[PDB]
């Protein structure tokens, strides 16, 4: 059904995402158990890590487009990523390495993430009908690798330890590299312009140097979130001023402010919602016992299921508004399950969390998928920078919001943690509902401006 | 996933026993371990437990007599039982739940040992 290169891209993306979500599923627990962080420290540190992983994304698109070539930058990103996973494995011998390791993973994602998509777009004559199914299938690939990693990494970390989990993330990257290398001939005429001139070692060195400096900067900022906060705060106020000096562009501004809320809420899955499953949910479903950390897998699961269906099935302003309503309902459901459907001992049915993750995945499908493809219709570089910088700030804020559910290490009673989760999730749901109503009200005007 | 209890036995009022719980494949360090006990003709009840990060919980009638503790090197959890009385006679079970909570009912726990019998006799030496 699809070009031959498409399948190579499918599997390279699947395996890289396997490595990344292998780390994301276990990181907050790894901070708490293995490094002795409080839940508050773990949450904000995870926020800063996600902030850097997603804010550096604009670097790798530049490097792929104008310095090294899309294919070369894919390989270089995979190598730096594999290195970072193996360094995280090494952190168990050398705890002082951890932030450097995480810094190395962030720079790697930043270098590699824009580039498979780019390459895939170039596998299709510019108006190929197959394109849309191709990008749906690409998203499904991301979410299959994520589903497997989120399901299995906590089980592996429990049975064999963090060293083996992280080394397997490295192996995932190595097998991404090997499938790319073994399929190189399939993409011989596909690439960006530097892919077909000999590689410039001047520019390759500038990229290695800037990458290393960036690794040390990321490591510092994850160590000192209290100034990552200020860096991103001042950068946001300043670039806000330089966007206000300089109508569809305003449409993007409103949409991004709404996206910020969506990203705050998404940031809850690896932190607050993860600990809510640990502390106040039954760890058994349909008769099987599970690692509650694996509950995070419910996000890619529902995505993998709903994307074909929703591919078969107002337009953009409305689609964003719908996604925000679904998200609101995800957290209101969590709150209701805690307020009215808990056991005498403070535990709730895992079917409530299955439903929470359904609502949140549907919000993801309506906002995320549409967001990126279509911010492009309204508009370039300045706004793209703004998008990444704001998504990143959203992850820092998500970390901060998660800290309102942090539990001290000596609390052992579910009846003490349940009201905390229910209060925070209910307020999140009500604020997101208000944001969704405002969005609905602005839908007609916004649909005017898009004209 | 499978826990082994050891250390039960028969002891006289005021004596001491130490139970120990050990796990097979998984690392018990991620688990809160609760000690439950079933006396003849009664339900399992929570007795004492330690979470994955040294939080502790005790049933009221055993406070000041039992201590739960954990040795993370040997991957073992202990229930030291002092000043034993006849009404501590029971089958004792260790149960494991991932994380930091110790819920009071057996349903909050999916991993269970087989049980070790503890008998405390009112026997005292003859005066
Ligand atoms: C809803 C998402 C579910 C994620 C799917 C789980 C992936 C399958 C795991 C690998 C194969 C099963 O392997 C094993 O099965 C047992 C019982 O079935 C499960 O349960 C056992 O291990 C986990 C963590 O290691 C503990 O939290 C659990 O209480 C223990 O009983 C685990 O999930 C898995 O270690
Ligand atoms: C296909 C050509 C690969 C060239 C690899 C050279 C790596 C240079 C190392 C520079 C160290 C700072
Ligand atoms: C690969 C480089 C590893 C550096 C680890 C630093 C840890 C020092 C602890 C004494
Ligand atoms: C196609 C080969 C890419 C070279 C990148 C390796 C730089 C260390
Ligand atoms: C854009 C919201 C920032 C909030 C800072 C407390």
């Amino acid at each position: 059904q699809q070009p031959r290169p498409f399948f190579m891209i499918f599997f390279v993306e699947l395996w890289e995402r396997f490595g990344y979500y292998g780390v994301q599923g276990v990181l907050a627990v790894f901070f708490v158990k293995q490094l002795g962080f409080s839940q508050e420290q773990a949450f904000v540190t995870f926020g800063a890590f996600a902030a850097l992983v997603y804010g550096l994304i604009s670097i790798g698109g530049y490097v792929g487009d104008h310095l090294l070539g899309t294919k070369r930058t894919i390989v270089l990103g995979a190598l730096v990523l594999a290195i970072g996973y193996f360094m995280t494995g090494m952190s168990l011998l050398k705890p002082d390495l951890i932030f450097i390791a995480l810094g190395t993973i962030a720079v790697g994602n930043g270098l590699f993430k824009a580039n498979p998509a780019s390459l895939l777009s170039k596998c299709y004559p510019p108006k190929d009908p197959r394109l849309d199914g191709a990008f749906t299938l690409f998203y499904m690939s991301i979410n299959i690798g994520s589903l497997i990693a989120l399901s299995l990494a906590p089980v592996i970390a429990d049975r064999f330890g963090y060293s083996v989990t992280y080394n397997l993330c490295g192996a995932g990257l190595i097998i991404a590299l090997l499938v790319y290398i073994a399929c190189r001939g399939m993409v011989k005429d596909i690439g960006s312009e530097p892919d077909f001139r000999p590689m410039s070692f001047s520019k390759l060195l500038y990229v290695l140097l800037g990458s290393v400096v960036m690794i040390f900067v990321c490591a510092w900022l994850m160590h000192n979130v209290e100034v990552a906060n200020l860096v991103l705060i001042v950068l946001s106020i300043v670039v806000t001023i330089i966007f206000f000096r300089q109508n569809k562009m305003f449409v993007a501004f409103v949409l991004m402010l709404e996206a910020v809320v969506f990203y705050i809420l998404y940031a809850q899955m690896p932190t607050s919602l993860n600990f809510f499953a640990i502390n106040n949910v039954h760890h058994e479903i349909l008769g099987f016992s599970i690692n509650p950390v694996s509950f995070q897998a419910l996000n890619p699961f529902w995505v993998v299921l709903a994307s074909p269906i929703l591919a078969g099935i107002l337009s953009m302003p409305m689609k964003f508004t719908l996604g925000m309503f679904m998200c609101s309902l995800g957290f209101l459901t969590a709150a209701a399950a805690g307020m009215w459907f808990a056991d005498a001992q403070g535990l709730t049915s895992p079917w409530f969390i299955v439903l929470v993750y359904l609502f949140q995945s549907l919000g993801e499908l309506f906002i995320s998928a549409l967001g990126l493809a279509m911010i492009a219709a309204l508009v370039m570089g300045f706004i793209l920078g703004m998008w990444f910088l704001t998504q990143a700030a959203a992850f820092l804020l998500g970390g901060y919001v998660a800290t309102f559910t942090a539990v001290p290490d000596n609390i052992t009673d579910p009846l003490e943690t349940l009201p905390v989760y229910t209060n925070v999730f209910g307020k999140i749901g009500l604020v997101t509902l208000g944001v969704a109503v405002v969005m609905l009200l602005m839908v007609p005007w916004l649909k005017r401006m898009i004209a | 996933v499978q826990l082994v209890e050891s250390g039960g036995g028969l002891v006289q009022a005021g004596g001491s026993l130490r139970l120990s719980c050990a796990a097979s494949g998984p690392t018990l360090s991620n688990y809160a371990v609760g000690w439950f006990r079933q006396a003849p003709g009664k339900e399992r009840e929570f007795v004492a437990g330690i979470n994955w990060s040294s939080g502790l919980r005790y049933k009221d009638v055993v406070k000041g007599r039992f201590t739960v503790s954990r040795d993370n090197v040997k991957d073992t959890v202990y229930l030291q039982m002092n000043s034993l009385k006849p009404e501590d006679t029971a089958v004792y079970y260790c149960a494991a739940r991932f994380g930091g909570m110790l819920p009071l009912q057996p349903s909050g726990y999916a991993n269970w040992g087989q049980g070790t019998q503890v008998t405390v006799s009112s026997h005292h030496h003859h005066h």
Side-chain angles (χ1 to χ4, degrees), chain A residues 151-152 155 158-159 289-292 294, chain B residues 1 31 98 111:
Chain A
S151 298
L152 302 195
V155 174
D158 194 44
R159 294 280 184 287
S289 313
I290 60 158
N291 193 319
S294 296
Chain B
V1 54
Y31 292 79
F98 186 106
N111 311 106

Side-chain angles (χ1 to χ4, degrees), chain B residues 35-113:
Chain B
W35 292 94
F36 289 79
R37 75 186 175 185
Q38 210 177 16
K42 323 231 273 175
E43 322 269 18
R44 297 215 182 80
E45 58 187 43
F46 186 90
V47 175
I50 187 177
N51 73 358
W52 67 352
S53 63
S54 300
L56 301 174
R57 227 195 166 165
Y58 290 101
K59 177 183 198 53
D60 269 349
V61 292
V62 306
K63 281 197 202 113
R65 311 185 289 115
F66 293 13
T67 86
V68 194
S69 72
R70 166 209 290 290
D71 184 14
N72 273 120
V73 170
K74 320 183 81 83
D75 221 16
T76 323
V77 168
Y78 295 116
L79 179 63
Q80 185 70 39
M81 300 182 81
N82 294 332
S83 313
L84 282 155
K85 317 186 167 184
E87 46 275 313
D88 304 319
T89 282
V91 186
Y92 283 68
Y93 303 90
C94 68
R97 154 187 190 90
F98 186 106
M101 292 308 105
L102 290 156
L104 293 193
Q105 298 309 315
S107 54
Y109 302 78
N111 311 106
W112 285 89

Side-chain angles (χ1 to χ4, degrees), chain A residues 248-249 251-252 316 370-379 383 450:
Chain A
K248 307 203 218 173
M249 313 298 274
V251 159
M316 194 156 279
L370 274 302
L372 294 174
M374 304 312 180
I375 51 157
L378 62 80
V379 210
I383 66 91
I450 60 91

Side-chain angles (χ1 to χ4, degrees), chain A residues 91-132:
Chain A
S91 323
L92 284 131
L93 291 119
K94 297 92 183 29
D96 261 39
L97 200 56
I98 181 55
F99 290 119
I100 293 299
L102 296 183
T104 297
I105 290 158
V107 171
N109 288 120
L111 284 170
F112 174 97
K113 189 208 232 63
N115 281 288
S118 182
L119 191 71
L120 181 63
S121 64
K122 291 180 188 135
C123 287
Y124 294 102
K127 58 189 163 215
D128 196 310
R130 301 174 292 183
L131 195 83
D132 283 338

Side-chain angles (χ1 to χ4, degrees), chain A residues 72 199 201 204-205 208-209:
Chain A
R72 288 201 187 93
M199 169 164 24
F201 289 84
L204 172 57
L205 257 292
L208 297 177
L209 250 52

Side-chain angles (χ1 to χ4, degrees), chain A residues 29 32-33 158-159 275 277-284 289 291-293 343 345 347 409-414 417, chain B residues 1 25-27 29-31 51-57 97-111:
Chain A
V29 172
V32 170
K33 273 301 276 162
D158 194 44
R159 294 280 184 287
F275 277 76
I278 296 181
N279 289 336
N280 282 101
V281 171
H282 287 284
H283 301 353
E284 261 191 78
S289 313
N291 193 319
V293 183
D343 224 350
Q345 69 190 322
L347 300 174
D409 303 87
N410 68 299
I411 299 308
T412 60
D413 182 6
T417 57
Chain B
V1 54
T27 174
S29 37
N30 300 318
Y31 292 79
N51 73 358
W52 67 352
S53 63
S54 300
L56 301 174
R57 227 195 166 165
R97 154 187 190 90
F98 186 106
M101 292 308 105
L102 290 156
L104 293 193
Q105 298 309 315
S107 54
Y109 302 78
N111 311 106

